């Protein structure tokens, strides 16, 4: 589960991101 558990991370974080980055 690490595997797509940590990746999601990667994949929240960016969203997240890219809205703070307007």
Same mark, same amino acid.
């Given at each position: 589960? *690490? $595997?797509h +558990? *940590? &990746?999601g +991370?990667? $994949?929240v974080g960016k969203t997240i $991101? &890219?809205?703070v980055t307007g």
């Open positions: 589960f *690490f $595997h +558990i *940590f &990746r +991370i990667v $994949h $991101h &890219r809205l």
